[PDB]
Amino acid sequence: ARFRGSNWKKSRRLGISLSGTGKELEKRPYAPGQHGPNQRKKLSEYGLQLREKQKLRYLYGMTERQFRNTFDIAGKKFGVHGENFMILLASRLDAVVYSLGLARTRRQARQLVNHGHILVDGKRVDIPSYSVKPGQTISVREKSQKLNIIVESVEINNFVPEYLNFDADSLTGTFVRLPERSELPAEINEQLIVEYYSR
Amino acid sequence: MAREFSLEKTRNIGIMAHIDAGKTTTTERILYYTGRIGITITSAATTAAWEGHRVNIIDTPGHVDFTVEVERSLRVLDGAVTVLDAQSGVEPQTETVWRQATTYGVPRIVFVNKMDKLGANFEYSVSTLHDRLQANAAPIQLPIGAEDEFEAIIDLVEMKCFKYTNDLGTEIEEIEIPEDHLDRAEEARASLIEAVAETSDELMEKYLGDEEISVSELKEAIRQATTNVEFYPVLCGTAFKNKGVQLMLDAVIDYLPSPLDVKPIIGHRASNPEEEVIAKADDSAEFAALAFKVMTDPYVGKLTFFRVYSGTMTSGSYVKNSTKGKRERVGRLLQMHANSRQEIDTVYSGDIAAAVGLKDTGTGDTLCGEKNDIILESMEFPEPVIHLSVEPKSKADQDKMTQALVKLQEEDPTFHAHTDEETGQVIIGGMGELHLDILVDRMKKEFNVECNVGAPMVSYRETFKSSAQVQGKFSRQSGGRGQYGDVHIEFTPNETGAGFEFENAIVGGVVPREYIPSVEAGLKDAMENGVLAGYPLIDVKAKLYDGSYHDVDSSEMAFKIAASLALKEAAKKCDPVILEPMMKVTIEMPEEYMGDIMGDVTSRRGRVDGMEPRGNAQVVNAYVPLSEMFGYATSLRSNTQGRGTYTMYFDHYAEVPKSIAEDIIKKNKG
RNA sequence: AUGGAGAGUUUGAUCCUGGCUCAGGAUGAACGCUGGCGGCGUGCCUAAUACAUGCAAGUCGAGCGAACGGACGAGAAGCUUGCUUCUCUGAUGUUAGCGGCGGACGGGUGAGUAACACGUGGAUAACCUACCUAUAAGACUGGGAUAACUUCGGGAAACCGGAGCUAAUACCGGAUAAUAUUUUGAACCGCAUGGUUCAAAAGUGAAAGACGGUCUUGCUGUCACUUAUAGAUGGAUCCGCGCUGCAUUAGCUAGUUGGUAAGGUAACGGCUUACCAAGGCAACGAUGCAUAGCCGACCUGAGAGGGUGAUCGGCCACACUGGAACUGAGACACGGUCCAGACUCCUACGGGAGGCAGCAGUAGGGAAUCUUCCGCAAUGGGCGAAAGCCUGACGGAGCAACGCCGCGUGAGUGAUGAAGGUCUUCGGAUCGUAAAACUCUGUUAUUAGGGAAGAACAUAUGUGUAAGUAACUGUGCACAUCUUGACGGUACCUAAUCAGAAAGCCACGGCUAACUACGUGCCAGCAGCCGCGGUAAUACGUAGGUGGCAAGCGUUAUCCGGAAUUAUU
Ligand SMILES: CC(=O)O[C@H]1C[C@@]2(C)[C@@H](C[C@@H](O)[C@H]3[C@@]4(C)CC[C@@H](O)[C@@H](C)[C@@H]4CC[C@@]32C)/C1=C(\CCC=C1CCCC1)C(=O)O
Ligand SMILES: Nc1nc2c(ncn2[C@@H]2O[C@H](COP(=O)(O)OP(=O)(O)O)[C@@H](O)[C@H]2O)c(=O)[nH]1
Ligand SMILES: [Mg+2]
Ligand SMILES: [Mg+2]
């Protein structure tokens, strides 16, 4: 991916398992760095808003500029700004592929789509930023239908959200409808992010 | 497409000689003959064609004041033609250019011009070559006739005589050598063969065998020796009356090297200075060239004359100025001919050309391919020999003055300008009085900045000759919280060059330890300002040994004022003196001028430290006042016939004589 | 409902008032450090400074004469029947010249302009309009020249001058013809002036041929032509309203304000000129001074508002400075003319040539802004019936992280918490799943193949069908067939090889996300503001770690915000 740093250190900073396993927080749930251990300072409100924004951004593996642009368009959509931003983040091809389970890690799914092993409606899409919409299908490239990584990931029967309908035999997923807040991760307080981008 | 002339057929040569030897006349005649089946010289280098060979010619100046041009031309040139006045042979500037060419390893051919002049003596000129220069030079021709009688030239290599029937340079008759001169021609040929054999072992054996040398074999041996810079062919003629110019061009073709025959060039990578890169004459290699001249042409704009060592480059492309580390757009490429400038689409290795459009590319810079990062060896120019304090007559033009100075420094590496902090004056350094005079006139007219020049001011120093205990007391207690300070300091003359030394012999805390640094700072500040003539005081030991202090009134400033008052009283009581910088001057010159040099040194109020031989000359070591060293180069050159050279560096400070010190004090006071 | 956050700083402490400063957005940006790629944009803001060099406006032989070349192919035999001339016929063509049209478009710039310049809304019963389209009537009969060309003469050249001859769709006389112009009768109508339509007389105003078809002692197709009428297009004038600072600018104006007459213009009108009067403007800001192209829009703000007028489009103005007209439907004309002035260059000294605020480029100024590129293949324009030619408009390459957007610099398992850096209470803590090792992928890169669209066409050729003709060619249309790409063998697709080439910038005292050690010691230094530094500095410099961003990151400059700190809200 574009960010190639210690995701474990990032998870420790942000107090969330970006991978979802919890391995990062199992042993050392405190922040990285020399002062990590014995850290007892309290975060200001701006610090809390920044931490929430960074949690969501590093969870979805986006850069600040694209994150802000997505926030803007979500705000321009009708509805609740934070929920719309979260569902739009989910609707990204990386997120859809990861939820379908064609890869174990979000960064792995990003690299797969970037190297072009995925097809939407039977057509290649190299851009992880691609925004999927209801009624679309995500497939896999024929030359890569038998990739070790993809087959191994499909073996592990991960949970498939309600807004996605996946068939592992064909390695074919369908984006049935737009997600909901309950389906989307609950470890994120979208109101804090909305206020952060308010100021 | 394809280069019109090959590396083997390319010739880069420079014409060099003493003043008025005939460099320009020879260059003009060369261009005239090459341009036939309004000759100018404004072009830095001229391109011509002779017998299917491309010849680039650079004409150099003779004066020692303009040695920078000779240096920068010999840096990029392959061969040289050294012109000698027939009546005088080798002259001092002949020696200077010969030494520069030897340093740069440039093969040379000598051309004895002015054979028609009264007093012309070819044998004397050759003997001067042997003695003055210590050069393995031999004639390859003989003159039949001297002065007005000069009418033919005997080529010795092919033992063939050319008769010139007129001064027009045409209608030359190729005839057999006359019988009366045949013996002399054969003797000269034997001498030439011996001279070449002294360098060539195979030819030495061939000659010792008494077998007849082939024309081709002899020419090959001469070419080898010349290109090895072990032999010097000597020709004769008169450029003014058009005799020997064709033979001189033929010798240029036959004996002077090509960009292949010349030794290779070594450069450093930008990121790997230790790394060495050899840039051979190969079109297929990467492009590397050296920009050796920069001028402005009123029609085409800035011209950057450069010599290409390796590779090729096409007009309308991008190159890298590795020295500056920037990118340059080569928009147009020009070559100057005898009568016109021609735009050329490509330049190959071993060619001298001019780029139009280069910005921020100075002489000595390297222009390399965008991908490449080579940097060729730059040129080292002599340091200034004369210095003058310059200043504009109108202060409103001082910014113009600075800009002009910068531009002049960019145009001329040897001309320097710098500001002196102690005196504040702007000092211009140059190769000689003539150089600085020309530059001053150029600033006055070309840049319209009228300036006046003079001897630079000399920064003097003061010191204490006698020791004394003194006391400084500053007590302003008129009302309220006042100001109190008291010190008792022993001032002593320190050993010269040891600097200021502060000692703290305070016992019992009579002066609180808080204020002692303030006392030292006050002494330093008061010594910076002179006590006798305003010049800094130096080489003094100040020992603060006693004092007083009032707890409420005493303060840092009060103690500094007390120290200053103590210094004033010590100046009154210690008989201060004025010191002047003394320079270590090393003068190198032929032994026959040693008496004159030492006499001039002692007249400059300096002393002769010693003497010692060095090489074939002598070196004199002396100490002279910097003030008395003004205009020394001119006097040295007059004393040594231009053969003397010198260096000077600061050595120490010495006491100024009584009258000079009194004059300085009076001038500073009023 | 879709929309609005504050913080520091005056005090021993406090509340208030109050300025100052910061957090945000933006840029035609510049600079510093750094730097992989692709797409789409953007790129002299300064000197409306001066310009070398190349190019940026031609076209028509189906208007005209003349000249070059001279096919096919005429004659003697030099006995060389393959080469020969002039005594012929003489084709496809080409061109110096006259003539038509174009050159007033397209393109550049923002100097001037405070003005009906621009915007918006109207009016002209006060207007002009080539090429284009439609309708009606015509295109008849004569003439004299002059370019070209030949010859002489004068000039360095530019170019002139004399003589001789030659055309036209060049020019001119005459006939016929108006809603055009005058006069007398009308009828109806409007908004003063007036407007519309119907009669009868007087004066007067045109033109052309070219290339083809046919039943060829005469009709006809296409283009071209004249007049009249309309349409369309383009231009012109007038008016309401809107549109900038200064009163330490209060008076301004004498063709000025009105009238009568005349002239003038497409046109009304003091537009101009004579005579009569003394008017006209102005605190609702005249006059003067300063500044400025205007607008669609652009930035900012919750809004109200504030700021701006790059790119792109509309309008205006200008083309070295100033004045003037001629040609022309259209100009008082960027690459036209004349004069004056300043400035370059040539001269034979008598005289001549010129104007990058066209595209590149040069010098200069500047913190700063591109290559003297390919092509008319697409769109558009000029001429022509058409093929076609010209087009630095334009379509595309080159250069620049200048902006926005997209994708990279790897992905999975990895405790065995390796070595090493830093700190340490000497237990250890941290860089750290980070690393190494294993496994995988090829975005991207490299190599080799395939390779678009952008292309409609026009023209040419067959077939029909509509008008008109006696018929025919032609005309328009419909359907058909071959041919046209600079970009460029570029994008893109397919196959193979390697994690291997591809991470830097600022910050960490509060604001404000991020703290430890060492060095220094009111020095060196930092700083947006409060301030920090005098020996145990989270504020200086380095190191480790951390935070924010990421091919960018910071600094500076400028605008709006925060500022309810001009407060209508
Ligand atoms: C070979 C040639 O042509 O030399 C020329 C070129 C020359 C070397 C010139 C002398 C001098 O002006 C030079 C300097 C250093 C001057 C200072 C700067 O302006 C710089 C940029 C400049 C560079 C070169 C320059 C212009 C020459 C020259 C001497 C002229 C004769 C005399 C002068 C007084 C005595 C007689 C000559 O003709 O020999
Ligand atoms: N007698 C004589 N005079 C000459 C000869 N060549 C040159 N000169 C003159 O000597 C002077 C040298 O001038 P120049 O060529 O400028 O020489 P430079 O100073 O060496 O460049 C001029 O006056 C020439 O005319 C020659 O062969 N004979
Ligand atoms: Mg000379
Ligand atoms: Mg202006």
Ligand SMILES: [Mg+2]
């Ligand atoms: Mg014009």
